[PDB]
Amino acid sequence: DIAGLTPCSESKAYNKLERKELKVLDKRLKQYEPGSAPYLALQATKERTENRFKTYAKQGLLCGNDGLPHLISDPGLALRFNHAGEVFIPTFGFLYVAGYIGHVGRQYIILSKEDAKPTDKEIILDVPLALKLAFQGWAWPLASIQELRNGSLLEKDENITVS
Amino acid sequence: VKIAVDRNPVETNFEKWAKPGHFSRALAKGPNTTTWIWNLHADAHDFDNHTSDLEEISRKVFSAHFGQLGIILIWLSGMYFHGARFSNYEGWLSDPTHIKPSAQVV
Amino acid sequence: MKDFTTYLSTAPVVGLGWAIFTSGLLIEINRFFPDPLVFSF
Amino acid sequence: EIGPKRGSLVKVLRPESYWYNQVGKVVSVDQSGIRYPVVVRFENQNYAGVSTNNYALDEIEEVK
Amino acid sequence: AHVVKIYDTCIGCTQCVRACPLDVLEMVPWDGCKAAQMASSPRTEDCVGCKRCETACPTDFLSVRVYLGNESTRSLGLAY
Amino acid sequence: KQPELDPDTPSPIFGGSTGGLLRKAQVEEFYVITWESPKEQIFEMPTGGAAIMRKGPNLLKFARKEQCMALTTQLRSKFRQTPCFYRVYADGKVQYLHPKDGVYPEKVNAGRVGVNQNMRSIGKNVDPIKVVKFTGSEPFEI
Ligand SMILES: CC1=C(/C=C/C(C)=C/C=C/C(C)=C/C=C/C=C(C)/C=C/C=C(C)/C=C/C2=C(C)CCCC2(C)C)C(C)(C)CCC1
Ligand SMILES: CC1=C(/C=C/C(C)=C\C=CC(/C)=C/C=C/C=C(C)\C=C\C=C(C)\C=C\C2=C(C)CCCC2(C)C)C(C)(C)CCC1
Numbered sequence: 211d212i213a214g215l216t217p218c219s220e221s222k223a224y225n226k227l228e229r230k231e232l233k234v235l236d237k238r239l240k241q242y243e244p245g246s247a248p249y250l251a252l253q254a255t256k257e258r259t260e261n262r263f264k265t266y267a268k269q270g271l272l273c274g275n276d277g278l279p280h281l282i283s284d285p286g287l288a289l290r291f292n293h294a295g296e297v298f299i300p301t302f303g304f305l306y307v308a309g310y311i312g313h314v315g316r317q318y319i320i321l322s323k324e325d326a327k328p329t330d331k332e333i334i335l336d337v338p339l340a341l342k343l344a345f346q347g348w349a350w351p352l353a354s355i356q357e358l359r360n361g362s363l364l365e366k367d368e369n370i371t372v373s
Numbered sequence: 374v375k376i377a378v379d380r381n382p383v384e385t386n387f388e389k390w391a392k393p394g395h396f397s398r399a400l401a402k403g404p405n406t407t408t409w410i411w412n413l414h415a416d417a418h419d420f421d422n423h424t425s426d427l428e429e430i431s432r433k434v435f436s437a438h439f440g441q442l443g444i445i446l447i448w449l450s451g452m453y454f455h456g457a458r459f460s461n462y463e464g465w466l467s468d469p470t471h472i473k474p475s476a477q478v479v
Numbered sequence: 480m481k482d483f484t485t486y487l488s489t490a491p492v493v494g495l496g497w498a499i500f501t502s503g504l505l506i507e508i509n510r511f512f513p514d515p516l517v518f519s520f
Numbered sequence: 521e522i523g524p525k526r527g528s529l530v531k532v533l534r535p536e537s538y539w540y541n542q543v544g545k546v547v548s549v550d551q552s553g554i555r556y557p558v559v560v561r562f563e564n565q566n567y568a569g570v571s572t573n574n575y576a577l578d579e580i581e582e583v584k
Numbered sequence: 585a586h587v588v589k590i591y592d593t594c595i596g597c598t599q600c601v602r603a604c605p606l607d608v609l610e611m612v613p614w615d616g617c618k619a620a621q622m623a624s625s626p627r628t629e630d631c632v633g634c635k636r637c638e639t640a641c642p643t644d645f646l647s648v649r650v651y652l653g654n655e656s657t658r659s660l661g662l663a664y
Numbered sequence: 665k666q667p668e669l670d671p672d673t674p675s676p677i678f679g680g681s682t683g684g685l686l687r688k689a690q691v692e693e694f695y696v697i698t699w700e701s702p703k704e705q706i707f708e709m710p711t712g713g714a715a716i717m718r719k720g721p722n723l724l725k726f727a728r729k730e731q732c733m734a735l736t737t738q739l740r741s742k743f744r745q746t747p748c749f750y751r752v753y754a755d756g757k758v759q760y761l762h763p764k765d766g767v768y769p770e771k772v773n774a775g776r777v778g779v780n781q782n783m784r785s786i787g788k789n790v791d792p793i794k795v796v797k798f799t800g801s802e803p804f805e806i
């Protein structure tokens with residue numbers, strides 16, 4: 211009912227599109243015998259296509275006048291409803307993974323600034339060090355906030371500028 | 374005209390790989406700038422830039438020739454094996470007029 | 480062996496080992512789990 | 521006896537210099553007497569690829 | 585023509601002269617450490633402005649900067 | 665003693681080319697170079713091909729000034745030979761340029777006084793304020 215959109219089960223265009231896809235698949239599915247390989251391939255394709263169309267319509271995702279699904283990205287409209295998975299939790303999942311990556315890369319590039327000729331370590335990596343740091347970053351929100359309160363990430367204005 | 378080769382001119386070892394840009398003494402010192410990588414790539418084959426030893430240059434060229442023909446032969450073998458394992462070559466052969474050639478299945 | 484393991488820290492390693500791991504993981508997740516476009520809830 | 525101890529690292533304050541506010545060890549503070557006595561040495565290259573430079577003593581300052 | 589300047593930031597490496605293609609600048613007395621030379625631009629009627637002398641000057645920042653000015657037969661490298 | 669230009673000087677054996685020697689060389693100027701060249705030898709021309717050169721001082725000439733500085737530098741490169749330059753205007757007046765010091769401007773000669781320079785750190789120049797005159801490109805001291 212939000213934005214004039216209707217749940218995607220009551221969309222005549224959505225079901226018409228599903229029927230269209232199934233007809234287009236079957237018209238060239240009827241070209242092969244039930245025993246050959248291409249026939250089984252088309253059978254499995256139709257299987258997961260029907261599965262596409264069935265599994266989407268659960269917990270509610272709005273389809274518009276076109277019958278296609280439309281993602282709701284506002285927190286608050288995903289709340290007070292059931293749309294928190296459209297894009298609200300994927301945001302936090304990507305933030306977690308991107309943190310993880312940046313944290314690991316930063317701690318690597320910092321721990322390499324101490325040894326002689328660090329440039330080599332950037333073309334010939336320290337594989338065991340990278341593997342160790344790769345399996346230690348999945349608590350980075352804890353380490354990031356308290357390393358921020360710490361101050362070990364703010365450079366005290368000792369860099370090259372021109373102005 | 375005769376044959377003239379040398380025995381064990383360069384010992385086989387994985388050391389010179391650990392120092393990219395060895396063929397260019399200017400590059401072998403170290404990558405202090407990101408241009409080092411691009412010069413490594415743009416000069417690996419520049420045999421006459423490595424050193425003025427035209428003997429070594431001719432050896433490098435005569436080796437890179439086999440290096441290319443090996444890839445050529447693996448390419449032809451890959452084409453033949455695609456035609457062999459997964460393709461309609463028998464179907465095409467029994468009816469070439471309408472059946473179309475296909476040798477790649479996703 | 481030693482120089483070989485040292486050589487295995489360059490483009491022909493992670494950047495290949497990496498992104499091969501990642502392509503494989505993503506393809507397997509999209510294969511076992513066929514067509515996701517929204518989270519479970 | 522004029523400039524900083526040799527081997528002691530110091531920063532730069534030449535406003536127009538590639539190396540600015542970052543530290544670099546001194547090669548040899550010119551004791552013979554000249555307007556740019558302190559010769560500082562840097563490991564990272566510049567746009568021109570030079571590693572060293574000489575600066576005035578009114579420009580360099582202490583360590584971090 | 586091309587207004588060429590030489591600042592006090594100089595070591596007298598004698599490189600911006602064995603690199604200049606038009607023999608425009610000279611090196612006369614300077615009180616240095618080992619070589620003791622300083623560059624100077626006594627004449628500019630033949631300077632084309634190729635900025636080849638600015639590439640070899642190792643001074644940071646550069647000792648010579650070519651202030652681009654007006655063009656002529658010499659400044660446009662015209663054999664016609 | 666800086667030597668001055670001398671006409672009627674022999675030339676090296678060469679066929680021809682299509683470089684320089686245009687209307688500019690007749691009504692505006694032409695440049696001249698002279699150098700020793702002992703041990704008759706083969707050299708390359710900057711606006712042509714290869715040529716031979718007798719022993720004893722021989723003189724050449726081209727269109728642009730760099731076309732002769734290139735030869736002077738070449739001569740530095742291989743065997744220690746010491747050429748010179750000359751200028752020519754429309755009135756026929758001749759001016760000697762390289763080397764005025766006789767010691768190849770890269771090296772100091774006993775003593776002179778240069779111009780177009782100021783004792784100031786790099787940068788630290790004047791802002792566009794008070795530079796409204798702008799005198800083309802300012803020497804900043806005149
Ligand atoms: C799937 C999915 C997800 C996510 C995941 C991820 C996390 C991904 C990623 C990824 C990543 C991690 C990425 C990254 C990247 C990067 C890139 C892509 C790049 C690039 C490049 C460029 C292009 C650049 C350029 C440049 C330079 C070089 C410098 C200067 C500037 C310029 C621009 C020029 C989730 C689960 C959440 C949900 C579901 C779906
Ligand atoms: C909810 C949501 C939303 C909304 C939003 C809003 C409302 C806004 C904002 C925003 C913001 C407000 C942002 C910000 C930022 C800030 C800052 C200040 C920053 C930062 C950064 C940092 C701090 C760092 C981090 C890191 C790195 C990068 C390196 C390594 C790792 C680490 C982590 C350390 C949307 C719908 C859209 C989407 C979904 C979700």
Ligand code: SF4
Pocket residue numbers: 588603604605606607608609630631632633634635636637638650
């Ligand atoms: S710009 Fe060129 S011609 Fe002018 S002084 Fe510099 S190097 Fe010589």
Ligand code: SF4
Pocket residue numbers: 590593594595596597598599600601621622623640641642643647648
């Ligand atoms: S090239 Fe620069 S530093 Fe060297 S002598 Fe000339 S002006 Fe001085």
